[PDB]
C-alpha cells in the first residue's frame, strides 16, 4: 500500500489525479554515459478520493 | 478467420532502454475443439542494435 | 560545407584540392566524442559515422 494525498492545508481532502512512479534507476550511476538511467519502472496511477 | 489475426504491441511497456536487455519471442497457438496446443519459438532471437 | 539528405538519403559533393597526397574524410549529423569517463563503460552508446 502506498498512500498519497496532496491537501492544501492538510485538513482538506481535495480532488484531482496523482501518479506514483518508482524506478530501479541505479546503484552509483555516473550519468556521463547519457543513456537513460532507469533500470526498472512500475508506474501506478489513480484519481484522488 | 477474417483476413487473419494481427497484433500491435507497444515497445514502451517493454522499456526499450539501453540496460533493458534482449528480448525473446514465443507464441502459444492454442487450437479449438482439439486442445493439443502448439507452441513455437520463431523470430525469437532478438537483435541487439 | 554542410549539406543535407536528398530523397534517397544520398549526397554528392566536390571538395577543394591543394593539399598533400593523404586525405581522410568523414561527415556527421552528430559530433565526435572520444569522451568516456571510465575504462569499463559497460554503459555504452554509439552512432555510426
Ligand atoms: C577549389 O575550387 C575553386 C573553384 O571554386 C578552384 O579555383 C579555380 O582555380 C583555377 C586555377 O587558379 C582558376 O583558373 C584561373 O585562376 C586565376 C586566379 O588568378 C585567374 O586569374 C584565371 O583567370 C583563371 O580563372 C579558376 O578560375 C578557379 N575556379 C573558377 C571559379 O573558375 C580551385 O582550383 C579548387 N582547388 C584546387 C586548387 O584544386
Ligand atoms: C498504431 C499502430 O499499430 N501502428 C501502425 C499505424 O500507425 C498505422 O496507421 C497502421 C496502418 O496499417 O499500421 C500500424
UniProtKB/Swiss-Prot annotation, chain B:
It is found in: Secreted. Transmembrane segments: none annotated. Secreted in plasma. Belongs to the protease inhibitor I39 (alpha-2-macroglobulin) family. Homotetramer; disulfide-linked. Is able to inhibit all four classes of proteinases by a unique 'trapping' mechanism. This protein has a peptide stretch, called the 'bait region' which contains specific cleavage sites for different proteinases. When a proteinase cleaves the bait region, a conformational change is induced in the protein which traps the proteinase. The entrapped enzyme remains active against low molecular weight substrates (activity against high molecular weight substrates is greatly reduced). This is Alpha-2-macroglobulin. The chain holds residues 296 to 344 of 1474 of the full protein.
Curated annotation (Swiss-Prot), chain C:
It comes from the Eukaryota. The gene is A2M. The lineage of its organism: Eukaryota, Metazoa, Chordata, Craniata, Vertebrata. Secreted in plasma. Is able to inhibit all four classes of proteinases by a unique 'trapping' mechanism. This protein has a peptide stretch, called the 'bait region' which contains specific cleavage sites for different proteinases. When a proteinase cleaves the bait region, a conformational change is induced in the protein which traps the proteinase. The entrapped enzyme remains active against low molecular weight substrates (activity against high molecular weight substrates is greatly reduced). Belongs to the protease inhibitor I39 (alpha-2-macroglobulin) family. Glycans are attached at residues 2, 16. It is found in: Secreted. This is Alpha-2-macroglobulin. Homotetramer; disulfide-linked.
